[PDB]
UniProtKB/Swiss-Prot annotation, chain A:
Additional record remark: The open reading frame (ORF) encoding for this protein overlaps with the N ORF.
Keyword Phosphoprotein: no
Chief site of localization: host cell
Organism: Severe acute respiratory syndrome coronavirus 2 (2019-nCoV)
Name of the protein: ORF9b protein
CDD domains: SARS-CoV_ORF9b (cd21955)
Superkingdom in the source lineage: Viruses
Subcellular location field: Host cytoplasm; Host mitochondrion
Keyword annotations from UniProtKB, A to Z: Host cytoplasm, Host mitochondrion, Host-virus interaction, Inhibition of host innate immune response by virus, Inhibition of host MAVS by virus, Inhibition of host RLR pathway by virus, Viral immunoevasion
Gene Ontology terms, MF aspect: identical protein binding; protein sequestering activity
Function of the protein: Plays a role in inhibiting the host innate immune response by targeting the mitochondrial-associated innate immune response. Acts by binding to host TOMM70, inhibiting its binding to HSP90AB1 thereby disrupting the interferon activation pathway.
Annotated phenotype, changing residue 54 to E: In strain: Gamma/P.1
Amino acid sequence: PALRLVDPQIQLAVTPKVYPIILRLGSPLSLNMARKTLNSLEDKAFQLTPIAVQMTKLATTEELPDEFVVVTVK
Amino acid sequence: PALRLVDPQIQLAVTRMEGRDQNNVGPKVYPIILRLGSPLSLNMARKTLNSKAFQLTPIAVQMTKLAELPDEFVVVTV
Ligand SMILES: CCCCCCCCC
């Protein structure tokens, strides 16, 4: 269990207002940024450059912000 | 398993912030595509007074299965 906080560079936008992200990880998570910049003479492909997400196991509950979103993975 | 596109209701906001300090570009918002191996819940949380306690408001993510993908988007892989 052990709720972990996502670094402030990765936040959720809900419609807008942007919220910190808390993870209740039951399964590992991956994050890839996709862009259509693999360009041929007629087509274009997607390149998946993975994003490194710094996660911090929440030390004490009093570190939690006043409002945030919680992503729970079974 | 399969791929689901989350509507612009929910999107991921990435802030580079830097190798010069930008600090004025702010966040860049990308549509989310999910590669669910196991299901995902998303609850908004707000602090309610106890003294320690948070008011969890659920959020219905209306993900749509593709068979139409934008040029820029992130892929959440579980
Ligand atoms: C780094 C955690 C990303 C949060 C996943 C977004 C799920 C939206 C339904």
